[PDB]
Write a protein that binds this ligand. Structure first.
Ligand SMILES: *[C@@H]1O[C@H](CO[C@H]2O[C@@H](C)[C@@H](O)[C@@H](O)[C@@H]2O)[C@@H](O[C@@H]2O[C@H](CO)[C@@H](O)[C@H](O)[C@H]2NC(C)=O)[C@H](O)[C@H]1NC(C)=O
Ligand SMILES: *[C@@H]1O[C@H](CO)[C@@H](O[C@@H]2O[C@H](CO)[C@@H](O)[C@H](O)[C@H]2NC(C)=O)[C@H](O)[C@H]1NC(C)=O
Length: 224
């Protein structure tokens, strides 16, 4: 992974700087002559400065799938997919096409998407024929009741607004419903179980004390 950042001030800003960026929420991680942006780096760079693995914030793209009770599903499965998309990190899931009759050539495609979403397909066709990273799924000569698999990869270029879209095999009425959601939030430790954090005179936000008015210092220790 790599991480190019510039004077980021928060975990959110860090995570938005690229898919390899991660954030250390460890208390007091910043030395006297360091900006808060030192908390933002690749995972191996943070481990090397002594951030523990569970203090490293790193929201990751995820796919979750659902099948119906499947008296209802025919030729395409799964029927429902939910994607959590961290910008620049593809989420991948497999779609299986299976037909009780002989199928000749199967194309897998999606409806028109906004500029912020990129979709590619790998096609795992019969006879070990495989295509990678194409604009649509494409297999030739499907025998009877033999599944073919398409690997769908979806990447967001920024933190998107939630939306759905569909994937279909051309010539068939089956639908895979794809729900997409952003994956841009850090789930950092908050201060609920310690009134001593930030001297009880600031808010703890992903390892950084945001001091109450009149208080200053990295731990809100100084009063002016
Ligand atoms: C995070 O750092 C704070 C700040 O404490 C300072 O302590 C100095 C001895 C020196 O190392 C300096 O670089 C550092 O920033 C820690 O707070 C201190 O905690 C002690 C008790 O352990 C108190 O007696 C001090 O009053 C208090 N000082 C301040 C300025 O708040 C804090 O413990 C530390 N947190 C963790 C989890 O290590
Ligand atoms: C979708 O299916 C493909 C093919 O079955 C999976 O690719 C295989 O992944 C394993 C690792 O888990 C490798 O050992 C195999 O060599 C891969 N096969 C091929 C043909 O490349 C892929 O992992 C599946 N994707 C998901 C998200 O489950």
């Amino acid at each position: 992974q790599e991480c190019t950042k510039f004077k980021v001030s928060s975990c959110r800003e860090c995570i938005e700087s690229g898919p390899g960026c991660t954030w250390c929420q460890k208390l007091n991680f910043t030395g006297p002559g360091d900006p808060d942006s030192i908390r933002c780096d690749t995972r191996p760079q943070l481990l090397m400065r002594g951030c523990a693995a569970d203090d490293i914030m790193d929201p990751t793209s995820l796919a979750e799938t659902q099948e119906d009770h499947n008296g209802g599903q025919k030729q395409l499965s799964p029927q429902k997919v939910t994607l959590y998309l961290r910008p620049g990190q593809a989420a991948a899931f497999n779609v299986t096409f299976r037909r009780a009759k002989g199928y000749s050539r199967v194309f897998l495609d999606h409806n028109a998407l906004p500029d912020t979403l990129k979709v590619t397909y790998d096609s795992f066709c019969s006879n070990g024929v495989t295509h990678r990273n194409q604009p649509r799924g494409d297999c030739d000569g499907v025998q009877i009741n033999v599944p073919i698999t398409f690997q769908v990869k979806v990447t967001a270029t920024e933190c998107i607004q939630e939306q759905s879209f569909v994937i279909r095999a051309l010539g068939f009425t089956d639908i895979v419903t794809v729900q997409v959601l952003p994956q841009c939030e850090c789930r950092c430790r908050d201060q609920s179980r310690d009134r001593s954090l930030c001297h009880g005179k600031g808010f703890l936000e992903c390892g950084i004390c945001r001091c109450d008015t009149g208080y200053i210092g990295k731990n809100c220790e100084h009063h002016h």
